[PDB]
Amino acid sequence: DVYAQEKQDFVQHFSQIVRVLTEDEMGHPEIGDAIARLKEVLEYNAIGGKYNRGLTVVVAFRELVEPRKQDADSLQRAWTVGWCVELLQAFFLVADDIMDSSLTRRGQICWYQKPGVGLDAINDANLLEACIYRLLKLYCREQPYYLNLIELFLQSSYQTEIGQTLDLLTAPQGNVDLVRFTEKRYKSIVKYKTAFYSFYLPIAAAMYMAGIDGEKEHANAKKILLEMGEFFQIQDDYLDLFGDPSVTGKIGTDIQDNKCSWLVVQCLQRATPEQYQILKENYGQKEAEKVARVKALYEELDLPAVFLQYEEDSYSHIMALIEQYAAPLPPAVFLGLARKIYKRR
Amino acid sequence: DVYAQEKQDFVQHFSQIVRVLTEDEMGHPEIGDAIARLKEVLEYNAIGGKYNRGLTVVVAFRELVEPRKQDADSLQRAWTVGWCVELLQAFFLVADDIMDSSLTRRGQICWYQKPGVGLDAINDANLLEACIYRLLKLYCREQPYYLNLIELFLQSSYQTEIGQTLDLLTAPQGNVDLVRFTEKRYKSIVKYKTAFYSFYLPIAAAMYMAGIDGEKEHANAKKILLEMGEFFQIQDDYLDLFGDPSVTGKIGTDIQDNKCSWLVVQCLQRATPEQYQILKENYGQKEAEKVARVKALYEELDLPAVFLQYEEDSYSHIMALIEQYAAPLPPAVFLGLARKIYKRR
Numbered sequence A, B: 001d002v003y004a005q006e007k008q009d010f011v012q013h014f015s016q017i018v019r020v021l022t023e024d025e026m027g028h029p030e031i032g033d034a035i036a037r038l039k040e041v042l043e044y045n046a047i048g049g050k051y052n053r054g055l056t057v058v059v060a061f062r063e064l065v066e067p068r069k070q071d072a073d074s075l076q077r078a079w080t081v082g083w084c085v086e087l088l089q090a091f092f093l094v095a096d097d098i099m100d101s102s103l104t105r106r107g108q109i110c111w112y113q114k115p116g117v118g119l120d121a122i123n124d125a126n127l128l129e130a131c132i133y134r135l136l137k138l139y140c141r142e143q144p145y146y147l148n149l150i151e152l153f154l155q156s157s158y159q160t161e162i163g164q165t166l167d168l169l170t171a172p173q174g175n176v177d178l179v180r181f182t183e184k185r186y187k188s189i190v191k192y193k194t195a196f197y198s199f200y201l202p203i204a205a206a207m208y209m210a211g212i213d214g215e216k217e218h219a220n221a222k223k224i225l226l227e228m229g230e231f232f233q234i235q236d237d238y239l240d241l242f243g244d245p246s247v248t249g250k251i252g253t254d255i256q257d258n259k260c261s262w263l264v265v266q267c268l269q270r271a272t273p274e275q276y277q278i279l280k281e282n283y284g285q286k287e288a289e290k291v292a293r294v295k296a297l298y299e300e301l302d303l304p305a306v307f308l309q310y311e312e313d314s315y316s317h318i319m320a321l322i323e324q325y326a327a328p329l330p331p332a333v334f335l336g337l338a339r340k341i342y343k344r345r
Ligand SMILES: O=C(O)c1ccccc1OCc1cccc2ccccc12
Pocket: A050, A051, A052, A053, A056, A198, A199, A232, A236, A337, A340, A341
């Protein structure tokens, strides 16, 4: 496994990342306390996940760069840019946990929920974002792709923020309005809020580092990657309810949380007026019996069979996209990712 | 007045700024609702202030660029970069109002306090920040100073966020610990949280636009501007309590809010153990009689006379700094600013 092979070298680079970021206090001791708080923010929020997005930068870089051009300095830059992706995600997750009043993340108390943190986490989230550009400057400022990476990280942040705006307007806290939960709205939320940063950004970053800056090659890679991002989120919505928590590592709450899930989108497209009333009365409630009623309506509408058919059609479509749009990139760059996303676990 | 002369052309450019930012929805109609929310965020938060920071970009640009090189396109870029400074400030103020639980800003309800907004303002603040880089790309991407401006806005955001971290650690909500309120800590908060973005950023931006990119010229301009920023905040702290609200346009609350004000810093340096107890028991309280006791202690310690002596020494020092470090820039660039800041109103 190319990911399990790079993981330890990637996680081990984090100590250097923290060291380099908390080494600006040497010349400025007056900001020492703020720098110590920065270290705590990084350690709590950037560590603990699976690092799949950041690892994708490293994996794609090794497949896109000639093995002779893969010197020690080039690999340090790849690990650094992979960590910038993880920091970008950490900035989004800290802020999103505040906005939707979450209690836990990765089975651990949300950063803002820690005693003595609270709404100071807004500033902590801004610092995580600032760390991306500090790292790009420290490691990549003399590289010809420097401006390409800055613009890519800034664009990915804007797209994600637009997707978050779209999501907040679609499911306003207290407003159980299923009329907003259309397929077109669902697809736009996924595209902007998750697909760009999760799938396009890591590969595009590795492409720029490899000197692949062509607009056409990026548009082609994007076409494959946004489609993979769409399937990823649809499968994640499906597994939230019908997945095995022992396998997924999570017990889903999308129904309780009034989420614009692919499942509710499909349910609304297939429900009779009476079935709609059942969903209208039980969706967004914390009661176990009420959540069981929504699950029951989903099984009545054969949503697991609709999902399975969708998974099959999506996999054929992604292989057709790879075949048409991969060249001149090695198909392995997209195939490695497709196997990680589509493999039935 | 060079500011009152540029103001109307600057404010009038805002409609174009909004138009250009809300004109990315043409090719992507799916994000229309998020773009309409973006427009509302811009209109509520970027409009209403005095625009002094953004206007400084425009004023300095006209004094730094040859009048022949001041064509229509160059001036549009100067107004755009001035607006990027105002957007950067708007991003900070929306977030800061959430973090310190403020009720009003410019006599108007804080954006997050508006019904239906709340903690969604965290995302609205991230969008204001993203707008800076959208505008720099749209207007300045073909300019030789493009990367210089991106790096300047990113560095100014990082410095401000560091200053905000320092401020939050110094005055934790509920923790009335006057031991933290040292002169050295006060000066670091002002430097990072306000002086860099308020004074250095606008002039430095105009310098890059004028092709003045030398590290030495920027270090020299910075030395003058950070000192002006320090005086600005000290005078603002003094006027918060001893200013005339009819003249300042504000009724101060620093004492009630447990602020690390220059006044409390000076009070702590001069107070006997008994005077310290009076301040310890009355600072950070909303009761009018208790605030009057702090004011009384300040007048007993002759803080208005200490301030006036400080204002005189600071003005001599800023003129000495201008004399030594202005060249090769026109001294008028700094003198115009010094008059706006030091003039007794
Ligand atoms: O890692 C996660 O957030 C995750 C969460 C839930 C289920 C599976 C997950 O990982 C799959 C995954 C593998 C390899 C590269 C990836 C690149 C972008 C997104 C996901 C990726």
